[PDB]
């Protein structure tokens, strides 16, 4: 009774963006809801789902008091640049995890600083099957991954764990009860991608643009926010604003 996260942009009536939390003040009408927007008229869930079937519509959400600092996952083109900005400019606000690997420790490496080294590939496989990792992968036949416990340690000491992970990790963290701020940075156009990345050609930028549209579709239920902008500085402001807003002690979580 009744707050929902909108999973689409709506341009009518109450405008809203993918990620916005709406207070639905009246849902009696099958086609149209009245809604408030926890910073008008909006399509009902069934109406929007009919339009899209012709599916991301609304997700019910609720308040939670948490007792840890939320991990941060930035997705989309520009994520590497923004993650770099955050951890470098704000080292006292963000922490990173130390990943695990089965690759052998090399001469100048330090366990617990470079990696948590795992002596047996079979043991790391068991741990992955036992859901001890939020993300794992292979390189040169060795396994690598970011553990639930490493993220929990950062969250519990009071820093935001900046995670370079894919969208499938968001779900894993929700299950672990370490709800992340998950922000997708959505490009406006291929032109915009080129504007803010004068490195790429208009074939590379097009592929990047394409990949982002698909990512938003695939993981659109899991984002807690979506940001857009015409400059990197506008984007970066909006990301910091979103991190602040979604920091709690009080936060919105799926119902």
């Amino acid at each position: 009774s009744l707050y929902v996260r909108a999973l689409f942009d709506y341009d009518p009536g109450l405008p809203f963006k993918h990620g916005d939390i709406l207070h639905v003040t009246n849902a009696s009408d099958d086609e149209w809801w009245q809604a408030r927007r926890v910073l008008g008229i909006v399509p009902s869930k069934r109406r929007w789902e009919r339009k899209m079937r012709a599916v991301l519509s609304y997700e019910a959400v609720q308040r939670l008091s948490i007792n840890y600092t939320r991990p941060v996952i930035i997705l989309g083109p520009l994520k590497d640049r923004i993650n770099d900005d955050l951890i470098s400019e704000y080292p006292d606000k963000f922490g990173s995890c130390v990943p695990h690997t089965t690759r052998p420790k090399r001469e100048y490496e330090v366990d617990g600083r470079d990696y948590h080294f795992v002596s047996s590939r079979e043991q790391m496989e068991r741990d992955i099957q036992n859901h001890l990792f939020i993300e794992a992968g292979q390189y040169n036949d060795n396994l690598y991954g970011t553990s639930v416990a490493s993220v929990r340690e950062v969250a519990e000491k009071g820093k935001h764990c900046i995670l370079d992970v894919s969208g499938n990790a968001i779900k894993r963290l929700q299950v672990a009860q370490l709800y992340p701020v998950a922000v997708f940075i959505k490009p406006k156009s291929v032109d915009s991608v080129m504007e803010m990345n004068r490195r790429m050609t208009e074939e590379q930028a097009k592929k990047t643009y394409e990949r982002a549209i698909k990512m938003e579709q695939e993981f659109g239920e899991y984002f807690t926010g979506v940001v857009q902008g015409d400059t990197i500085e506008e984007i970066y402001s909006k990301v910091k604003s979103m991190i602040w807003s979604q920091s709690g002690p009080t936060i919105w979580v799926p119902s």
């Binding site: 690759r103 470079d114 990696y115 992955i128 794992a136 992968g137 390189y139 060795n142 690598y144």
Partner: peptide, 14 residues
């Protein structure tokens, strides 16, 4: 970490 930039991700069941 160079190696982490080069991963083929494995799906975590379920």
């Amino acid at each position: 970490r160079q190696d982490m930039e080069q991963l083929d991700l494995i799906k975590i069941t379920p």
